[PDB]
């Protein structure tokens, strides 16, 4: 019969209040013989009714995919509320339930440090700026780079790694054209994490 | 049966002994049968094949059925950069040194911190991460007492990789 996957919001969406975090319950392998699907949603076991369910969409393998999207409150997600999606379909012997929530554990604040390039690399046409993010918990985080209020997306970020004290660390580095750096343009590392004051901090660097 | 490669430093340093390890035995180098596999007795089992550094590095295939070999692809030399602590972090009694290693292929590498001939405690090194151009990158972070940093002690990031000259480079830093 059908199967169910339940997807959490992305951390940046739960962390910036102007953004729109959603939980998404997806049902696949819905047959033609029994195409009707019903969703019941619960937040800490209490039924909610504000989900937006899309009509069924036939896939190229001749089964339907049915999607329901629950809008969450940012504070609810961050306070560890459990979101349950129950899926009924007449081909099932019983409804399928799936539950998700934010990673448990005592939040710890990242400290963020930016590191300017080496001289060695400055004899190439690109250069590396490093953002060192340390001491955070849980691992959920967003790290992004920007310049002049706009994204600088030519970066890589290490996945979070466990230190010996139980908290996480990572590095992000941004590859910029060397002329841009020499010209004195300011680059900024933006870190979004539930344990930061206002869930956001930015650290900036430029040449001297 | 699950077959394991040698570790990076073992293939790159000629004084070390690289081994392929077949855990749970026949053994083959590029199809041909070999008979130097020291097996050791089952424990409520593992077989070890000592390999030649150059055979591993030339891409020979080791068969135990699972086969293993070095990752295929043109080797690319790592670039190594070191960063002193942020002046912001200097307000704490621990500070961080960063060694940034980028543009290498294959992923097999050893990136280690040392001072005065000896390994440094309290470091963390990421497993290598795939970049857009097909190469790999990683960072290694050493945490030291501000005391040692400010006193002018010299810290070194040693990197061992097949595409380096002598399979080795060392980049050091200290206060100004
Ligand atoms: C018929 O066709 C069906 C549809 O497929 C089309 O695909 C083509 C390639 C082609 O084949 C077409 O013909 C075909 O029609 C097909 O359906 C598929 O069924 C699979 C199961 O058989 C499903 O596999 C699962 O996928 C999960 C990951 O899925 C995401 O990733 C894929 C890969 O890119 C993507 O295609 C999916 O759509 C899905 O995308 C996510 O979508 C959500 C929601 O929209 C996004 O989240 C939202 O994003 C918005 C902004 O857009 C906003 O940010 C919201 O807030 C946010 O919620 C995600 O961003 C997006 N993610 C991406 C892109 O990465 C796997 O996780 C899952 O793995 C689990 O289950 C396995 C068993 O099935 C198990 O072995 C595995 O270990 C794992 O187990 C889980 O472990 C977790 C933690 O470790 C636990 O949390 C779980 O409890 C645990 N689960 C267990 C044990 O069960 C799984 O592999 C596939 O998704 C589905 N495809 C689609 C499109 O729905 C069908 O199978 C076909 N049938 C036949 C018979 O062929």
Numbering used by the authors:
A (entry chain A): 237 to 444
B (entry chain B): 240 to 263, 275 to 294, 302 to 321, 333 to 444
Published text:
By exchanging residues from the IgG1 CH3 homodimer interface with residues from the TCR α/β constant domain (TCR Ca-Cb) interface, we created a new CH3 heterodimer that heterodimerizes more efficiently than the previously described KiH and SEED technologies. To further validate our concept of interface exchange, we solved the crystal structure of our initial CH3 heterodimer and demonstrated the successful importation of the TCR Ca-Cb interface within the IgG1 CH3 domain pair. We engineered a technology based on biomimicry wherein the interface of a hetero- or a homodimer is grafted onto a recipient homodimer to create a new heterodimer.
We then derived a new pair of IgG1 CH3 domains having TCR Ca-Cb-based substitutions as follows (BEAT): a first CH3 domain based on TCR Ca having substitutions S20K, T22V, K26T, K79Y, F85.1S, Y86V, K88W, and T90N (BEAT CH3 (A)), and a second CH3 domain based on TCR Cb having substitutions Q3E, Y5A, L7F, S20T, T22V, K26T, T81D, V84L, D84.2E, F85.1A, Y86S, K88R, and T90R (BEAT CH3 (B)). The resulting CH3 heterodimer was then used to create an Fc-like protein made of two Fc-like chains, each chain including one of the two engineered CH3 domains (Fc-like chain as follows: IgG1 hinge-IgG1 CH2-engineered IgG1 CH3 domain). To further characterize this fragment, the BEAT Fc was crystallized and its 3D structure solved at high resolution. The third and fourth sets removed the Lys 26/Glu 13 pair of symmetric electrostatic contacts. Supporting positions 3, 7, 22, 79, 84, and 90 further contributed to break symmetry and add asymmetric contacts. Q3E in (B) created a new ionic interaction with Lys 16 in (A). V84L in (B) created a new asymmetric hydrophobic contact with K79Y in (A), a contact directly imported from the TCR Ca-Cb interface.
